[PDB]
RNA sequence: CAAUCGCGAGGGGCUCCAAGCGGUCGCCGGCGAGCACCACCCCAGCCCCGCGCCGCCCCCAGCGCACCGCGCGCAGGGGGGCCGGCGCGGCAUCUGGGAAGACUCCUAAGGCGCAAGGGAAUACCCCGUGCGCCGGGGGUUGGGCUCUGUGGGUGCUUGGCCGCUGGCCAGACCUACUUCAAAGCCACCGGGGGUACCUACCGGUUGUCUCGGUCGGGCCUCCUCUUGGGGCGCCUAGGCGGUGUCUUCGGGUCGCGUGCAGCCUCCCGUCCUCGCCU
RNA sequence: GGAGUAUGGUCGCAUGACGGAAGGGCACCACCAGGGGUGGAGCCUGCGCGCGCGCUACACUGACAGAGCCAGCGAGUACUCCCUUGGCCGAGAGGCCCGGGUAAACUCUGUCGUGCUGAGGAAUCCCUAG
RNA sequence: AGCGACAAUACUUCAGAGAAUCAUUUCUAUAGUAGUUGUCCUCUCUUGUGUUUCCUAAAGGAGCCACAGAUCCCACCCGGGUUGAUGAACGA
């Protein structure tokens, strides 16, 4: 729950001035630009990953057609030459 | 309360009425409290007294208005009546407030504080967890929690020990004596499966050499694990804490300009939302 | 080459039946006790002017006015009833501002006093503890 | 409709090579390869295992009476204390 009563440890603290205030503000603004930065970079690595697995799926379809044509022509060959 | 007595607003011609209000004698009336209406101090107020300002009224004291007049609009000198208010200073008392004595008052048998938790009339307030502080009650030359030890008890009471019909609790003696091995049965390994070697059992074979067989076992194999399960993590919608901008308004501020208009760096709060923390 | 499994064309074929008695059991399509409808008026969906069914209206249980006091289901960046006389900002299209059309109940306490301000024929139908 | 063919057209399915190591309480068939020893002294990291304990975090007490001991706490008193007790992050 949110606390509506300012406790003593909140009524006790040190109000901090301009130098450390601006060190806090600069440090926050850097951290937000880092978070949006890595959100972009991993969005684009995810997209390129999806293209990679897509075309790997198509090339394994063609590998399956090599399997079926090769085994079918085989059992033509020995399938005829056993009789 | 009971007997009694007085005055007299207010109204009407020394008299009349009355709202009211008091006194005296009895109270085999009842209630309440007794230093203290005091001590110490502070803040005011009533009154009386001091000294100086104003507020007002004075008298002399000059221009314009009527050169057929007073007085008037006003500039203000110096003193006066020193009249009252106000200001300041005491003021033996009286009045009120606060403080106040530790017998007193100290809100009650309970209260207070700090820190957390929950709810709001969201400035205030309210309710009952952890730490403390006092109090009431009770209270025999100390008390209390906790832990540990020993003895008895938690089933009806007949001795300690031995080579026990006897002996010993200080022990003693130590090694004999012998005619005749044995009756059988039974005897817990998880399931399926393999069988070369060992073993078991069955049937043998020659002369103690081998062979064949069998719901046993040794040995081997694959199940007797991988769960309608639990724990600990990861991930994450989100919440909270710390915290930072953005909008909006109100203040505050360094400074510039013309110190108008404004510009203008910085600070605080509100509104508003978004954000970030190994 | 085999095996299937499909797909689409081509061809041939023509021991019974019916009752009666008496005895059991059950029923708001029965008796019994009651309660509720619908059917009088109006609006109406439906079904075939008619039959209904839902809803509205009609008083003692009134009307007015205060005070008090109670629910449970309900959460998709979702939800607004109209259509406008005007005016703003509008070169133009729109957005604006101003006018027109968490309960009922219940409790308790006080003011008026039946005052077109009248509860529905025959019938047939339903209903037995939250 | 229903069977039979009677051919076509699709789909699906019907092999597995090479090399090495492992294993027979020596030797998996290979001589093309560590590894025939009861070493001495320390330190560090690390897998398990027993017991005891605490937490996650509760639960249940083989229970009674007597006597005794101990740590701790409170009370009293003593000692040092506003000529400074206690708390409390150091520049010479």
Automatic annotation (TrEMBL):
Residues 61-83 are annotated as: Disordered. It is found in: Nucleus, Nucleolus. Residues 61-79 have a biased composition (Basic and acidic residues). Signal peptide: none annotated. It comes from the Eukaryota. Belongs to the TRAFAC class translation factor GTPase superfamily. Bms1-like GTPase family. BMS1 subfamily. This is Bms1-type G domain-containing protein. It comes from Chaetomium thermophilum (strain DSM 1495 / CBS 144.50 / IMI 039719) (Thermochaetoides thermophila). The chain holds residues 1068 to 1150 of 1163 of the full protein.
């Amino acid at each position: 729950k949110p606390q509506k009563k300012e406790t003593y440890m909140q009524k006790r603290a040190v109000v901090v001035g301009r130098e450390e205030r601006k060190l806090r503000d600069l440090m926050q603004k850097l951290t937000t630009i880092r978070k949006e930065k890595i959100a972009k970079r991993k969005a684009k690595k995810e997209a390129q990953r999806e293209k990679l697995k897509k075309e790997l799926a198509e090339i394994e379809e063609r590998r399956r057609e090599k399997q079926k044509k090769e085994k079918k022509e085989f059992w033509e060959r020995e399938g005829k030459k056993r009789k």
